[PDB]
C-alpha cells in the first residue's frame, strides 16, 4: 500500500560503477531508489539533501570512492565533513537521522551496494513515511 | 447591531475595536482586540542566550533598541559580568536616541493628526500629509528630530533600525572621538526643536480642551515606571508603583518583577491584562510610559525638561489620569531624553576604549529591564550549563496599558454613544484617539 | 502613481525604515498618492486600483492570508517588502515548534501568566497558520526588498524605478565585497569555530577565518556590512543571492568545506556538528521558512 520514496547521490568513478556492476552480476535489490549521477561526491552539498526531503524523500542515499581513492584526490573528504554536521542538522528539524545514509563503495563492490540497498530500505521502511511533504501542503 | 473599527489605524500594530448594541438597539459590549501573535517566548528557546539581543530588536521596528538593550542587561546577568562604565553609557546614549525618534515618531506622525483635526470628515486629511500640506514647518521638525535621534542610533548602535553593538559584557565598538564631536553639535538643535514640541503640544492640546475632548477615556489606576533615587530614569533604577492618590505603594529590583506583577488572559485578544498582584484584576490596574514615569518620579534627570514638568505638575496635579495628557508627558520626555543625548556625549568616558568585560561562568538565570518608549520592559531568560535558553519570559510595555486601552475605549463609547446612530465617523476615531494616547506598539505588547 | 501598504507577520521595521527617507519621505510623497498605509492613515479596506503595492511581513496568521490575497487583487505589482515578507524572517523561527507550543507558553505557562480556566484568546483574532511561510508562498509576488530591514536609499531606488517605468534591479554579490575586513591571499581556513562571546576579536581580520560563524559569505550585499564593521559577525538578514535557494545549506556546506582545510584528510568530521549547539538557530535566523526543510517535524 506504501513503497518507500529512496533518492541516491553516486559518483561517476565508484559507486556509480559500483552499482553498474551488481547490475551486471543480476544482484537483485529493493526498486525504491532512484539514483543521481555526480563526478565526485564532493559535488554534494546540504542544500542537494535538503532539497530531496522537500520533494517528499523517505530516505537520502549517497555514494561515494573510499576515503583516499577519490578520483579527484580529496572530494569526498569535504563531503565526509558535510554529511555529518548535516545528520544533526536532520535531527534538529524532527527528521530521523537514519533517513539520510552515506557510505564508501568502489565500482568492483557490487555486493556491498547490493546490500547497502538492502539494509538503507528495510531501514526506511521499517521508519514509515517521511511526513514533511503532508505537512508542508497544508 | 455589531460594528468593527478595523483596523485601528496610526498605531504600531494589529488592533481593532468592536462595539456591540442589544435588540433594543442600546450599547452592550465596547471591546478592544489585538489580533497578532508570533510567540518569541518559546521559539527562543534552544538559541544561543548571546543571540537572544539579535532576535528581541525584531519584536518590534521602532523600540528595537530597547529590546536590543534589556536583551543585553538578560544576557550580562546570565553571565556573571558587570560591563564597563563606557559601555553602560554608551547603552545609556543609544536607549535616549532612541527615545528620541519614537516620540517625535508618536506624537507628530501618529498622534497630532486628530490633535490638528480632532472633527473632520475628510480621512485623507487626517494623516502627516494633510498636516505637512497646511503646516509643514511642523512635519519638517518631525523628521529631523527622528533623523537626528536614529543618527545617534546607527553611530552607537551600528544600525539604525535593530542595532547590534550591545554584546556579552558590554560593547563591540566603542566611540570614536570625531563621531562624539559630531553627534554633540547635533544635540543642541535636537534639544532645541524638542522645546518648540511641548509648545505645539501645549496649542494642540488647548484645541482638544476646546472640543471636550481632553477627559476622553478617564479612569485613576496605579502607575508604575523606574527611578534612581526617585529622579526619572529610563535606563537604570528600579520599579516604582503608585497608587490612584500618588502614594508609594511598592519599590523594587526589576529582578523581582514575578513577585508584583501578573498578567491575565481574556479570551478576546492576543493581547494579555496585566495587574499588580497584591492588589488584583480591578484593584491592581496600572498604567506605564510618560505620564505613568512623570507621576512616579520625584523629578526629572535633565533642567529644562523638569522646568515644564514643575509647571505641568502644579496645573494638573500628581499623580494626573488623563490619558490625552499622556500626549503632553510624552513631550516632556522627548525633551529630557533630548537633553541627556547631549549630556552623555560630554561625558569624557562616552569615548573610552574599555568598553567590554570578559565573560564569566554561566549561570542559568537573567533578568534585563528598561524603561522602552512606551513603558517598562523586561527580558527574562533562563539557559543551560551550555548557554542555550531553556525558558523566558517578556513583559513588553504596551502589554501593560491594555488594561487602560480597553477601558478607556468603553468610556468613549459610554460619553458618546447611545444608539448605533451616534457611531458616526468622528466618534468612532474618538474611540482610536484614546488608544493612540497610549502610543500603542501591538507587535511589541504580544511578542 | 496609487502607492499602498500593508503589513502581515512583521515588526512594522520595514515601514520605519521607509520613514528613515527622511526628508526625501515627503518628496517621495509628493510625487506618489499613497491611497492605504494603516501606519500613516485612516484608509481602512484596500481601495481598487493600486498600482504598486509594499507588503511587509511573512504570512503567519489566517488574516494575513486573506490581506496578501486582497492585495494581489488590488495591485498591479506586488512587493515583498524586507525580508521577513521575501523569507520569512525572524519569525519563521516559530517553525521549530508547533503553534500549540507557541501558544500555550505565551498564555499558560509564561512565569506571569495567570489563566485559571487555561484558555488560548480564540474570538474575534486570527487563527494562526500551520507554518510562517514567506509571501511568495501564497499569492505571486513581482518584486523584493531585501534586508530586515531594507536600507532607505534602496526601498527608494526600487519604489523610483517603478514609478519611471523601468525593472528594479538588486545587487547581485556576496557581503565580502563590501565589508572592510582583510582576508588572506591563500584563501579561508578554519581551524576552530568560537560562539560570538568566545574570546576578542581582531578588528582587521575576516570574522569567518578568526572562527565566528559569519553569514556575509552566505549574504546579499547592500546593506554596507554594518555588523562586521561594528565588530560583530554578519547575522544573514539580507538573505541569500539569487544563485542560492536555501542560504543556510549553502552556508554550512561552505563552513564544513573550509573547516580543517590546512588539515582536510585528518581534521575530525564530528568536532563542528559537536560544537555548533543550535545549527538552526545559527544558519536560519532570518531565512527558515524559505528552507528546503522549512520545519521542524514533531
Ligand atoms: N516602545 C516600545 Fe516596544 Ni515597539 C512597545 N510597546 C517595547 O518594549
Ligand atoms: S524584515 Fe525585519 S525590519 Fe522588516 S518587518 Fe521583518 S523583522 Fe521587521
Ligand atoms: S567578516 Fe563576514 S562579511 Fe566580512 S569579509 Fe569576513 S565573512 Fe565576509
Ligand atoms: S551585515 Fe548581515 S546581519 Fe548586518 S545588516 Fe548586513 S545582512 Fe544584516
Ligand atoms: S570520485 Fe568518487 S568520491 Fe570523488
Ligand atoms: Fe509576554
Request: aromatic share 6%; hydrophobic share 35%; charged share 30%.
Amino acid at each position: 500500500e506504501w513503497e518507500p520514496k529512496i533518492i541516491g547521490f553516486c559518483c561517476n568513478w565508484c559507486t556509480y560503477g559500483g552499482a553498474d556492476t551488481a547490475g551486471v552480476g543480476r544482484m537483485q535489490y529493493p526498486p525504491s531508489i532512484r539514483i543521481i549521477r555526480v563526478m565526485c561526491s564532493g559535488r554534494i552539498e546540504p542544500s542537494l539533501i535538503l532539497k530531496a526531503f522537500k520533494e517528499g524523500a523517505d530516505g537520502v542515499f549517497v555514494g561515494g570512492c573510499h576515503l583516499g581513492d577519490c578520483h579527484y584526490d580529496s572530494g569526498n573528504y569535504k563531503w565526509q565533513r558535510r554529511v555529518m554536521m548535516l545528520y544533526e542538522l536532520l535531527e534538529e528539524l524532527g527528521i530521523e537521522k537514519e533517513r539520510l545514509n552515506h557510505e564508501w563503495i568502489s565500482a568492483s563492490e557490487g555486493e556491498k551496494f547490493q546490500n547497502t540497498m538492502k539494509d538503507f530500505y528495510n531501514k526506511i521502511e521499517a521508519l514509515g513515511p517521511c511526513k514533511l511533504k503532508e505537512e508542508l501542503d497544508k | 447591531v455589531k460594528l468593527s473599527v478595523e483596523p485601528v489605524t496610526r498605531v504600531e500594530g494589529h488592533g481593532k475595536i468592536s462595539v456591540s448594541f442589544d435588540d433594543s438597539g442600546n450599547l452592550d459590549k465596547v471591546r478592544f482586540h489585538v489580533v497578532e501573535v508570533r510567540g518569541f517566548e518559546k521559539f527562543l528557546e534552544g538559541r544561543y542566550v548571546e543571540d537572544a539581543p539579535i532576535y528581541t530588536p525584531r519584536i518590534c521596528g521602532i523600540c528595537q533598541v530597547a529590546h536590543h538593550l534589556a536583551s543585553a542587561k538578560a544576557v550580562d546577568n546570565v553571565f556573571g559580568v558587570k560591563i564597563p562604565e563606557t559601555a553602560e553609557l554608551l547603552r545609556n546614549l543609544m536607549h535616549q536616541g532612541a527615545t528620541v525618534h519614537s516620540h517625535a515618531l508618536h506624537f507628530y506622525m501618529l498622534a497630532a493628526p486628530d490633535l490638528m483635526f480632532p472633527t473632520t470628515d475628510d480621512v485623507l486629511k487626517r494623516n502627516l500629509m494633510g498636516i505637512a500640506k497646511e503646516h509643514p514647518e511642523i512635519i519638517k521638525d518631525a523628521i529631523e528630530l527622528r533623523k537626528a535621534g536614529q543618527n545617534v542610533v546607527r553611530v552607537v548602535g551600528g544600525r539604525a533600525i535593530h542595532p547590534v553593538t550591545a554584546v556579552v559584557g558590554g560593547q563591540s565598538k566603542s566611540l570614536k572621538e570625531e563621531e562624539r564631536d559630531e553627534l554633540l553639535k547635533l544635540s543642541e538643535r535636537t534639544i532645541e526643536l524638542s522645546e518648540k514640541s511641548i509648545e505645539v503640544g501645549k496649542k494642540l492640546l488647548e484645541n482638544i480642551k476646546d472640543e471636550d475632548l481632553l477627559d476622553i477615556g478617564y479612569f485613576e489606576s496605579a502607575h508604575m515606571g523606574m527611578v534612581n533615587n526617585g529622579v526619572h530614569d529610563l535606563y537604570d533604577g528600579k520599579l516604582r508603583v503608585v497608587n490612584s492618590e500618588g502614594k508609594v505603594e511598592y519599590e523594587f529590583d526589576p529582578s523581582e518583577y514575578m513577585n508584583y506583577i501578573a498578567e491575565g488572559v481574556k479570551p478576546y485578544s492576543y493581547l494579555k491584562f496585566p495587574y499588580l498582584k497584591d492588589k488584583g484584576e480591578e484593584d491592581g490596574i496600572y498604567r506605564v510610559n510618560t505620564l505613568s514615569r512623570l507621576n512616579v518620579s520625584d523629578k526629572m534627570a535633565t533642567p529644562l525638561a523638569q522646568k515644564y514638568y514643575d509647571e505641568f505638575v502644579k496645573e494638573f496635579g500628581k499623580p494626573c489620569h488623563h490619558p490625552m495628557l499622556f500626549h503632553y508627558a510624552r513631550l516632556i520626555e522627548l525633551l529630557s531624553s533630548a537633553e541627556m543625548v547631549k549630556e552623555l556625549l560630554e561625558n569624557d568616558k562616552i569615548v573610552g576604549e574599555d568598553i567590554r568585560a570578559e565573560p564569566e561562568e554561566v549561570v542559568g538565570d537573567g533578568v534585563g529591564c528598561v524603561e522602552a518608549p512606551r513603558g517598562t520592559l523586561i527580558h527574562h531568560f533562563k539557559t543551560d550549563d551550555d548557554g542555550i535558553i531553556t525558558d523566558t519570559n517578556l513583559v513588553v510595555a504596551t502589554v501593560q496599558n491594555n488594561p487602560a486601552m480597553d477601558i478607556g475605549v468603553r468610556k468613549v463609547a459610554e460619553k458618546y454613544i447611545k444608539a448605533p446612530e451616534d457611531a458616526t465617523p468622528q466618534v468612532l476615531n474618538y474611540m482610536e484617539m484614546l488608544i493612540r494616547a497610549y502610543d500603542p506598539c501591538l507587535s511589541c505588547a504580544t511578542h | 502613481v496609487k502607492i499602498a501598504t500593508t503589513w502581515l507577520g512583521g515588526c512594522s521595521g520595514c515601514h520605519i525604515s521607509l520613514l528613515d527617507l527622511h526628508e526625501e519621505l515627503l518628496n517621495l510623497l509628493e510625487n506618489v498618492e499613497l491611497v492605504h498605509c494603516p501606519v500613516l492613515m485612516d484608509v481602512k479596506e484596500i481601495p481598487d486600483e493600486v498600482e504598486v503595492a509594499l507588503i511587509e511581513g511573512g504570512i503567519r496568521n489566517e488574516e494575513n492570508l486573506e490581506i496578501a490575497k486582497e492585495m494581489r487583487e488590488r495591485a498591479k505589482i506586488v512587493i515583498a517588502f524586507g525580508t521577513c515578507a521575501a523569507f520569512g524572517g525572524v519569525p519563521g523561527l516559530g517553525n521549530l515548534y508547533s503553534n500549540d507550543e507557541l501558544l500555550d507558553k505565551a498564555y499558560k505557562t509564561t512565569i506571569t501568566t495567570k489563566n485559571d480556566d487555561g484558555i488560548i484568546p480564540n474570538e474575534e483574532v486570527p487563527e494562526l497558520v500551520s507554518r510562517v511561510k514567506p509571501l511568495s508562498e501564497v499569492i505571486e509576488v513581482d518584486y523584493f526588498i531585501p534586508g530586515c530591514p531594507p536600507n532607505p536609499e534602496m526601498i527608494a531606488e526600487v519604489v523610483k524605478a517603478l514609478l519611471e517605468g523601468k525593472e528594479p534591479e538588486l545587487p547581485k554579490k556576496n557581503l565580502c565585497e563590501e565589508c572592510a575586513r582583510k582576508k588572506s591571499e591563500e584563501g579561508v581556513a578554519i581551524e576552530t569555530i568560537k560562539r560570538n562571546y568566545e574570546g576578542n576579536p581582531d578588528p582587521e581580520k575576516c570574522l569567518l577565518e578568526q572562527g565566528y560563524i559569519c553569514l556575509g559569505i552566505a549574504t546579499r550585499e547592500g546593506c554596507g556590512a554594518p555588523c562586521p564593521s561594528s565588530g560583530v559577525p554578519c547575522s544573514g538578514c539580507s538573505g541569500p543571492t539569487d544563485a542560492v535557494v536555501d542560504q543556510g545549506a549553502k552556508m554550512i556546506s561552505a563552513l564544513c568545506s573550509d573547516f580543517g582545510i590546512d588539515n582536510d584528510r585528518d581534521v575530525d568530521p564530528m568536532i563542528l556538528p559537536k560544537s555548533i549547539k543550535d545549527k538552526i538557530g545559527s544558519f536560519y535566523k532570518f531565512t527558515l521558512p524559505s528552507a528546503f526543510v522549512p520545519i521542524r517535524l514533531k
